[PDB]
Amino acid sequence: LDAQVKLLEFTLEQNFEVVSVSTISAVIESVTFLVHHYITCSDKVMSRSGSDSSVGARACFG
């Protein structure tokens, strides 16, 4: 997960000019499907340590 997040952070700083629309649409489709699955498939229980203070995925305008 650390390496995947690092990859995403690196990608977010890149310039995507002159990138084919096929790949862009493919990544957008896959990512939207992934995030929809993530939100709909959330676990029934939630257990965090007292140190952990992150905001749940299903929470907006934090």
Partner: protein, 432 residues
């Protein structure tokens, strides 16, 4: 996407498509799409401009949201507490129910665990774990079943490991819940608890539970499991321990309708014209007006009701009848049986006053209708629930309407409506 959409229609079409279907694009009479406060906020932002609102109207948005209001209101039951809860209270943040329960174990040799249920936790430096389990060399899980005297809406489970010796903390915890107390069902895969000074397992969705089975996995680096306290936090159905509205009610549709009617005044008329026709819309809006707060303050609902009732005389008369005579809807059809006819609040009084004292072509007729409801009421007194029990506040509202319209110099023949026969009816009523 909304900012970069070539035209507002591009953004509106997916939104309207979503609003026109139910769960996973399903259809059905009572199926309606899932709304949420963030999604509602986004839709309002998309509908922030006059062009976007005009396109929304042109694409059937107003009719869609009004129909969705009526349907969703039919398809939900109010979870807000009502006079049944009031009566239960009259007959005598979450609450720990572990102390009331009985805690047992499947292992015959386990130490009694009742000390875990005690509401008062042991001293944080207590050198001996309040409860201990000795694992056989072939044992991976030790179970503790807490039976409660009655089912509770369980929301959290707190397990306090022996803080002095965390090596004895369970490596993971599998929580099973039984609503009937007989058939345990795992909530989820075991929660990893090694290295935790406090184990708080929150149920995202509170579950009815009369029994909770905690299966604690042998610690990574210890043959004994030491626990201090177990709390089962939650609520009761009633009593003292019984302490996103857009997602669970139809109020989001009413907030959308209010935004359409009020956000851009110049469009109000058009929006009202698109909203008035839908069947049972006024009954549904009145029902939402007289319901306990569910994410929309009364003034906005009143504004919606007034703007719809004033957009034509027929609808104004229908609204007067709904507020005074019959508010029920005119297995999938809306019912709205839940409310007594003619009940009055500050909101209903204000709506009736605005209907009576707003100057437009229909005002006379509205006043006429009001006066009719008075005479009928008086007539019923001389011998339909709205007639049998006219709100004193509504009668006083009609009186104030008459007074202020007389003092306002209206453009209709107000004195002609107040004939001597009505005056005699009211005199007889008051003397009775």
């Amino acid at each position: 996407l909304s900012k970069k959409a070539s035209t507002v229609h591009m953004m509106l079409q997916p939104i309207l498509t979503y609003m026109a279907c139910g769960y996973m694009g399903r259809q059905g009479s009572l199926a309606t799409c899932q709304l949420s406060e963030p999604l509602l906020w986004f839709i309002l932002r998309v509908l922030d401009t006059s062009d976007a609102l005009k396109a929304f109207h042109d694409m059937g948005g107003v009719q869609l949201i009004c129909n969705n209001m009526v349907t969703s209101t039919r398809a939900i039951v109010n979870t807000a507490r009502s006079m049944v809860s009031t009566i239960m209270k009259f007959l005598d943040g979450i609450h720990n129910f572990a102390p009331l329960g009985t805690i047992t174990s499947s292992s015959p040799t386990a130490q009694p665990a009742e000390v875990l249920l005690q509401a008062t936790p042991p001293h944080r430096r207590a050198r001996s774990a309040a409860w201990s389990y000795i694992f056989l060399p072939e044992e991976a899980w030790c179970d503790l079943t807490i039976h409660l005297p009655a089912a509770v809406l369980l929301k959290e489970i707190h397990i306090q490991p022996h803080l002095a010796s965390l090596a004895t903390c369970p490596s993971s915890v599998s929580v099973e819940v039984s609503a009937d107390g007989v058939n345990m069902l795992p909530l989820s895969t075991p929660v990893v608890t090694s290295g935790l000074t406090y184990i708080k397992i929150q149920l995202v969705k509170a579950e009815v539970a009369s029994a909770v089975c905690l299966r604690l996995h042998r610690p990574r680096d210890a043959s004994t499991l030491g626990l201090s306290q177990i709390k089962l936090l939650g609520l009761t159905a009633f009593g003292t321990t019984s302490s996103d509205q857009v997602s669970k009610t139809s109020i989001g549709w009413l907030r959308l309708l209010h935004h359409c009617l009020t956000h851009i005044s110049d469009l109000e008329g058009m929006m009202a014209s698109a909203a008035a026709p839908t069947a049972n819309l006024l009954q549904t809006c009145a029902a939402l007006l007289m319901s306990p707060y569910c994410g929309m303050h009364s003034p906005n609902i009143e504004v919606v009701l007034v703007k719809i009732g004033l957009q034509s005389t027929r609808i104004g008369l229908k609204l007067i009848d709904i507020l005074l005579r019959n508010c029920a809807a005119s297995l999938n059809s809306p019912l709205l049986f839940g409310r007594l006819n003619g009940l009055s609040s500050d909101s209903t009084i204000d709506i009736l006053y605005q209907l009576g004292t707003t100057q437009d072509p229909g005002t006379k007729d509205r006043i006429q209708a009001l006066l009719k409801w008075v005479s009928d009421s008086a007539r019923v007194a001389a011998m339909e629930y709205g007639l049998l029990m006219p709100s004193p506040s509504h009668l006083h509202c009609v009186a104030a309407i008459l007074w202020h319209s007389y003092e306002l110099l209206v453009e209709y023949d107000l004195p002609a409506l107040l004939d001597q026969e009505l005056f005699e009816l009211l005199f007889n009523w008051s003397m009775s």
